[PDB]
């Protein structure tokens, strides 16, 4: 599973990405939108985004059209080779989408919820669908069973449209997908660094330490 | 399965490895601090253990920031083409296997309590990770739900990172990671040597001895 | 499924082999004494069951030390081809399978009750492992389960060591290690029997030959 | 799955056959039995079903003896390439089938109850198994978990002899069967016939010419 | 589980209830128009099998008009207290239904073949529901699967209304009709006698009676 | 399980109010606009559906404000004693069936789409809930799933609250509210009518007609 | 779940009773002829078996008809108030068991080997009914199944007639009944005596002891 | 499902009473610590929800010693008799709960995150017990399994004691405590205002507003 | 559920009971046994540990015989009303229960390994029974699944029984005891110790003081 960054915050990405567990970043107009602000041009976010992320970035065109989503997408294809052009699940993104997979432009189509949904946008050979499992969460419908379809759904027609796993509010979304086996997530910030804790890691880790020093008072390994 | 020790004590790994049964052994800060007294040096200690077991000899590192992770992990690694440098879920821990994993030097991520974590060492090109089940026993949650739940998440993206259940208690832990699936299971001696054993093994062939006896005076097997 | 017969009963074997049911036969101590009475010796015997088999015939080691077992193994080995060692899960068991798997001396691990003695001998390299499903019911514990779970490990672990269920007390037991996927079971031969039998087979069959005498009063077919 | 009529009954057999939905042909010696009246042979009865029937066509022995059930195995097989001999399961058919096998004359185990019965007619090399179903719904069993067990068995062993399904008395026997994934049906002409029947298909189909004849008074399609 | 005959035959009713193990009959049009032949008039069977069955015996109306429906209950009621009405599943018949069951005439919804079918039955007051397993069955429906469905929905509601599983074509049909729960299983002639049959009994019965032999010639029990 | 239909259709609840099977009515603004054109007053619509209708009759409010709701509720009930106010579920909504309850006015919370707001509206003393199925159905999620949960959280908490099933497209939506339990299912016309059928029971009953002629040319039952 | 013994074995009954876990007897025809011999009289050790046994003793009639069961069944009953009249499952065992129930006379339907055979014989009245799981384990049936069928369908139709589990060969038919809720295991004495064995109670007691011996040379305690 | 408001801020409170869906308040040290700012005093956040709040309003001691807990406990106590003290899972706090459920003070025992700590909780007599699912949700493991354990747990032993799941991050949270059967969830104020909302509530209102306005150009409903 | 503590370690019972958590305590010869040394007697342990535990304390028989172990069951009784007498499963054991239970004096029935063992023990009147769990686990079965068991059996005959889950070795055999609904768990103290923590509850408590400090530095709650 693929782990991106849900933020258009080029210092959590910055952080994320040295941590060296950022597989690549999804942005969207609202978040790009929160990083904008007193000066900040969304058009450096995005491409400080692309330049300092390896992997794949996801920026969504803001057309509603075909024809501006397509040009919107072309731009945002020619940024980078890394970026992908997040398209939402609409008559036109499908059109979009479909137009832009025969133009070998990496798709992510967004604000999916529901399976069909996510089967529409692979048939349309979209690069990523990325279903909003807090935003079903939000509405009293557990997100991740949507997620959970998909797989099934994609399984059953060998679909290499990769199910990106989107609007994670927890670590609990983090790991149904690993279990489902959806092929990205990507969370914010918060719940990134969230993944790697544990607090019988810190209490092990510091009863190894404790113990070391019986061994070795400095607390170095010679060897 | 592999069956590793989970000891720094010499004799019972020359027994364990005497007995044929012990795949590799893991070491830690805290076993090795148990054994490192009486004037006996952590130093000796791990390059005897190097050398009497063929398999894996996991050594964790003592440092907790990247730079002397590495630094350690590659003086383990110095120590024998078996060494297998032993690094804690941390964020440094994650980038110095990142790092070490491109050096070509095997580690094993340990401190893992959740199946996320587990992943994120494996993305992190991890040879191990060892979820502490025992310690999760312990906090009042299954911890062989996490190998379950691990071991689900590696087939789903066909990782090759092996799951090294460790903090093992007791032979259904041990059972119970063969049933999941579980690459390694590392042991404490105690639990190594009841693995083998069971009250109808030991009446049936005293049965067996008794009754071959009618036919054989001597107890031999003549042929 | 492969089906042995589990008794050192030369008529029985030579029965069972004729029936052409027979797969293979083991005996152990007990068996064989039960046999070795009244002048026949258990030399005489074992030598005989290797002849009329042709397929594996399991012949247990009586020493219990490592040493005697390998030697002792050496021998049975050396008397056929198809003599297979029957070792018991112990200690020097399994060095002792460990060292005949290296001489290429198929080895049947018997007594054993649990899953994870199953897989200590797999490990060991033993060809077969013989959970004794009766004597678990026997204290009140459902033998076929252990069965279920060695097949399981054996099936993660891609293991090759046959799962033989041995203490085969009814048609039940072999009808759940089918069902299950045993590799083989061995059978005493009052179950061997059974194994063919059922009342509709015989109603069946006595209708269809009265029906036939309506039609050929000397119920022959003559085409 | 194939399926085949289970009756010697020639006008059942032609009109089958003529749907193009009969596989083969059952006989036993009860079907045979009464159609072999009023001066009816049943050499030639068995003769024009073989005639008739391009798939297979199930001939049983009569014979309960070894030597006349391989005797009257090979009148049938020379009657014709499609003519499988019915073996019945007992210990002498087992035989039988075993000698059949190796002669590469096809074999039908018949009068199968249990899935056991069944491996063994499998381990003897039959071609077909049939257990019946209905005779032991008849007995209060519910005679499709024969049919799953033997599926499991065979998947498990990778067993080749097919599964046919036998004594079926209605369309879920058959409806089960497919399910679990039987290789062959038998069924009587009864059953055969109420297969291709649906109430909805029948109105659909008149709804359908009734719509039709709004756009085409005569009822037909011109193109 | 209640258990009554389905039919109209004088003898095979006088049969069942003679063993004492049929708790009611219940007729249909057709059933009676099997037996009305010969001279025997329909008003002479239903009479008789009124006078011969102690339990309800359910009389189906042959009007498909509400007034004639009630009108022919009232008659078909007066015929003596356990006759039921049976009324077949349709708008007048639930109407007929209603009306019957505050005159306190009990009433058998008759031609149900869905569980919504036997739910507006039992709304509209009928004391008994009988859904057609076996024309079901005939469609390639399992039959039992609504007769399950009508058990759940009827508990769910407290629903008194009785589910009497009609259309039994064989022993299994009445084995899940009382696993279920069902109220009532209505069973051809052929089917309640196979009911009580098993092969094991009768060669149970042989041996205790052969056994029985030894200790008293005369096969007495003298006590 | 109470039945409604849901519409404002005078014809459709007369018919089915004569039918017998018509427990109650669920009327809403889009149902009353759809009667409540050329000429037809809203107000007489919902009088006269009261008027016909025994049981509970459901319209709604269409003040989103808690005073116009709560103002409203009261003008609905003083039309009858069966009138039933339905109430959106929203914030005034809540407000407003919380003072209707205690002023002993039946409430049905409507435009329910998840348990959570089921359980709101139970919680502010609802006496239905109504969740729309097929309007989930229509964004691809299974509506009955709602019902099924709603029916555990009603049963866990012993609520009195009626789940009242509405946007119910098809007959299988009232299958699956009978098998969960729900205690009403309102719906339209057109399903209503087609639960009494299945083509099963028009052919039951021509067969029954047809063996009854057999018995009596003129079709009647005379007794 | 009452355990009876399942033999006509004195010794065995009054060793049992003594035990004081025995709650009573069944016999039947062979195993009473198995005690019946060098001059023993059946009808004195039936009469002995109801003096040493305070619980339930069940004699089976021997009479084939429904008169010489009910004539033998009073004289059974007639030899004490613990005498249970054992009747074959047959159509005359059911009119025997009807008038016998109706004459406060308690009986054991025997010789049922499914679960309809196990509620006809409730349905007449029967005190116990007594499926025979051994054999149907040895027809390669799993005969565990049929009582756990039968405990469904007694507490479906909450009827009182008792499970007595029958033909028990092992610890398991007993272990398995307990988990079904059997009313009554019957089993013969060398499954009784294992039931209270287990390897680990010996070891364990053996421990036990060695323990208290350092703190008690002579194993008393004296308190 | 009681649903309370984890929050100390006064216009949450205000505004959640206000809407009528809150049952009780939790406040703890933190959300406390939130408001008590600005010359806010916690001693009036605290007096001011009492009076504002009807129901259990629960305020955690901060004391960590017996004495200390149990003599807040009662300050606490006195400020309201809907005042709930609020008690860590500690073993003081164990002991603090059982003085005073003693003295019938009611109390909430917080910092509950396995089902044990829970179960301590209740068999000191605690009237609340609050797992804080987020925070296991936040560590990687599914915060929800510990209520339905401790659902299941106090289920199997009658104990009263209220599940009060804490740390509700989303509404999922509160569907899953609701389907399990928790008796509280107390939840933050912009979850307890998502509870009442989902796009086809607002969707179906919109267009219920819709099509009055066809038959009521105002929108208003005179009746 | 209960909790006892079980040992003889009179520091251990002192602590335990101080903290408020232990019902109870479980000896057996071996714990006594390790108390009773450097001239401590157990006569004294034990009277000290009857003095110090309010609630039930199981001592047990060291007599392997039936009179023995009454008489010592008498001794240990009149020490004091809390004292349970432990009497191993074992034929004598049974006895001594059946007439210690008729005596009023509470037994414990320990050394269970199997469901059966249990059902046993509860028919001979035994108040408590102990499996072992531990002990299982030790031999590779999962001990749990037994406690599974005798719940089970135990709730379906009603069974006053109170299963004393014993062998405990981890949290997680409490756990699963409290969700299976064993009656009693009896843990060691160091399992005792851990049950009350978690690594949450310590931090959640920290962070709690940390915020309490920002609204009163000296950390007070004064109200």
């Known amino acids: 599973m693929k782990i991106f960054l849900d933020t258009a915050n080029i210092d959590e990405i910055r952080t994320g990405v040295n941590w060296g567990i950022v597989d690549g970043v999804t942005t969207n107009p609202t978040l790009i939108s929160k990083e904008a602000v007193?000066?900040?041009?969304?058009?450096?976010?995005?491409?400080?985004?692309?330049?300092?992320?390896?992997?794949?970035?996801?920026?969504?065109?803001?057309?509603?059209?075909?024809?501006?989503?397509?040009?919107?997408?072309?731009?945002?294809?020619?940024?980078?080779?890394?970026?992908?052009?997040?398209?939402?699940?609409?008559?036109?993104?499908?059109?979009?989408?479909?137009?832009?997979?025969?133009?070998?432009?990496?798709?992510?189509?967004?604000?999916?919820?529901?399976?069909?949904?996510?089967?529409?946008?692979?048939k349309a050979g979209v690069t990523y669908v990325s279903p909003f499992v807090g935003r079903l969460d939000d509405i009293g419908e557990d997100g991740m069973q949507i997620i959970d379809m998909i797989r099934t759904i994609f399984n059953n027609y060998i679909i290499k449209t990769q199910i990106l796993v989107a609007s994670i509010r927890n670590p609990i979304h983090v790991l149904r997908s690993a279990v489902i086996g959806a092929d990205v997530v990507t969370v914010p910030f918060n719940v990134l660094?969230?993944?790697?804790?544990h607090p019988k890691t810190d209490e092990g880790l510091a009863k190894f330490l404790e113990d070391w020093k019986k061994v070795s008072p400095d607390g170095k390994l010679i060897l």
Chains 1, 2, 3, 4, 5, 6, 7, 8, 9 share one sequence.
């Open 38 to 122: 007193n000066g900040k041009k969304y058009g450096d976010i995005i491409r400080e985004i692309l330049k300092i992320v390896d992997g794949p970035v996801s920026v969504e065109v803001v057309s509603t059209k075909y024809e501006g989503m397509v040009e919107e997408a072309r731009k945002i294809h020619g940024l980078g080779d890394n970026a992908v052009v997040a398209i939402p699940m609409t008559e036109d993104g499908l059109r979009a989408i479909k137009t832009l997979s025969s133009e070998h432009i990496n798709t992510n189509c967004t604000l999916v919820f529901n399976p069909i949904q996510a089967l529409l946008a692979a």
């Open 193 to 197: 660094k969230s993944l790697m804790k």
